[PDB]
């Protein structure tokens, strides 16, 4: 005969979730909680509302200078973030250098919209030749061409009279202005294009005080050319003025960019393309839609995102140890 009884015990079930501990691995428990997000959609999406500027085979340089092969991006709408490939094919179509180029790429990460404006009209070049500035290194479509936002001026008749051109920024927003100098291959070519043998480019701002001088040298062929192009940039503050003076080898501006909207942004390196989707967290490898507090997709994300970690596994133990 059994006298009345009472027992104390604990929960168990059919759960085979496993957790880990400093002293013990793979311990099976009642309840667990995963905190690591591991899945993405392999696609580039809009961020909340907004579509990213996806340069395809274009570089930041190609777009802003206006490489002919970059005509897709002649007047871009506002972006959330820029996507650029690792080695864009259409950079500086005519071989050369973009000065302080990285620092320019930096300003772009807090810029969300530009507005292209003409500050020296191509029609205005009455005593020089605006339309002979064309290269085989810069092909539009078989027709050989040039960068669109800038102008490769050349001598008229036999002469190249001194240029004095100026633009006063009467806008309220900052202006990104681009220009350049051309470095010929020998004195013979120099005097053929520009007449005058000893030349310069001076550029005046309330802050700039520049005088560039073309630099003759014998060089290896790049894309069939030995000459080179070297580009330069500035920010023109509101109510300030930029003043050009030159005498040869001047690659003059036509269009500049007004900085119209600033904000969170980034230049994202990725080979992917537009995914026609939308998320609140984007990664160079795909977008994330998740409640997890942690992910291990890629450290460079933009938007309302989980915190990045490198783990393969992060699971918390919540319930109690489940029966052997």
């Amino acid at each position: 005969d059994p006298g009345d009884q009472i027992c104390i015990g604990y929960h168990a079930n059919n759960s085979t979730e496993q957790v880990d501990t400093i002293m013990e691995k793979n311990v099976t428990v009642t309840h667990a909680q995963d905190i690591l997000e591991k899945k993405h959609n392999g696609k580039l999406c809009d961020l909340d509302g907004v579509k990213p500027l996806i340069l395809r085979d274009c570089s930041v340089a190609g777009w802003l200078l206006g490489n002919p092969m970059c005509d897709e991006f002649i007047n871009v709408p506002e972006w959330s973030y820029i996507v650029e490939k690792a080695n864009p094919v259409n950079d500086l179509c005519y071989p050369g250098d973009f000065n302080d180029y990285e620092e320019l790429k930096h300003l772009l990460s807090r810029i969300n919209h530009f507005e292209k404006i003409q500050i020296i009209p191509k029609s205005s070049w009455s005593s020089h030749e605006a339309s002979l500035g064309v290269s085989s290194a810069c092909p539009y479509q078989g027709k050989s061409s040039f960068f669109r936002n800038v102008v490769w001026l050349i001598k008229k008749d036999s002469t190249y009279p001194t240029i004095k051109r100026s633009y006063n920024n009467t806008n309220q927003e900052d202006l990104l202005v681009l220009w350049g100098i051309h470095h010929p291959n020998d004195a013979a070519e120099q005097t053929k294009l520009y007449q005058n043998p000893t030349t310069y480019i001076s550029v005046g701002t309330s802050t700039l005080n520049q005088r560039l001088v073309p630099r003759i040298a014998t060089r290896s062929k790049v894309k069939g050319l030995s000459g080179r192009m070297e580009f330069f940039w500035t920010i023109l503050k509101p109510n300030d003025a930029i003043n050009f003076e030159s005498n040869g080898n001047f690659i003059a501006p036509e269009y500049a960019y007004k900085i119209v909207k600033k904000g969170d942004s980034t230049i994202m390196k990725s080979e992917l393309e537009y995914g026609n989707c939308n998320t609140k967290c984007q990664t160079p490898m795909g977008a994330i839609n998740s409640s997890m507090p942690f992910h291990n997709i890629h450290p460079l994300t933009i938007g309302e995102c989980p915190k990045y970690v490198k783990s393969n596994r992060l699971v918390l133990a919540i319930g109690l140890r489940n029966s052997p």
Partner: protein
């Protein structure tokens, strides 16, 4: 575990206790059944939910990597840059992995300590009115119906009330008959 209850003197957990983590299994003359302890179950849930939230919250703000680009004769600072972002990514992975690991242990020994502290809340209510069997169950020296079991569950159990019947049942088993 640290406290010797779970997977201890209580071999096995009860598949049948489906409304709590910890509980009781009574067996008197009227029959038997399962009853979960509400206060200790609730005491642990609040403890685990505060733990989960303390962990997610501590990693709220944590280093966020940013893209920076450097040219060809900026190789030095480029490399400084990489080892830095890598460095912090390494620190914060270690902080995360290790915190789960350490607090995973402390979570399991909490359930253990909770069962054993529940076992002893019962042990020190009954005393000599019942015999500790050693498997985590108690065998009474008196009769205890369903309203008495309830007094044990919620802590109402009256010792002087049953101590008389108990000390006489003790005498009956000491003599032999």
């Amino acid at each position: 575990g640290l406290f010797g209850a779970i997977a201890g003197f209580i071999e096995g957990g009860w598949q049948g206790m489906v409304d709590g983590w910890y509980g009781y299994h009574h067996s008197n003359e009227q029959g038997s059944g399962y009853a979960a302890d509400k206060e200790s179950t609730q005491k642990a849930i609040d403890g685990v939910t505060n733990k989960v939230n303390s962990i997610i919250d501590k990693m709220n703000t944590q280093f966020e990597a940013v893209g920076r680009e450097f040219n060809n004769l900026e190789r030095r600072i480029e490399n400084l840059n990489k080892k830095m972002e890598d460095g912090f990514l390494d620190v914060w992975t270690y902080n995360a992995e290790l915190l789960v690991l350490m607090e995973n242990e402390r979570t399991l020994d909490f359930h253990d300590s909770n069962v054993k502290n529940l076992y002893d809340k019962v042990r020190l209510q009954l005393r000599d009115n019942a015999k500790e069997l050693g498997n985590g169950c108690f065998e009474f020296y008196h009769k205890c119906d369903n309203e008495c079991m309830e007094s044990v569950r919620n802590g109402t159990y009256d010792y002087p009330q049953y101590s008389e019947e108990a000390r006489l049942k003790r005498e009956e088993i000491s003599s032999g008959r």
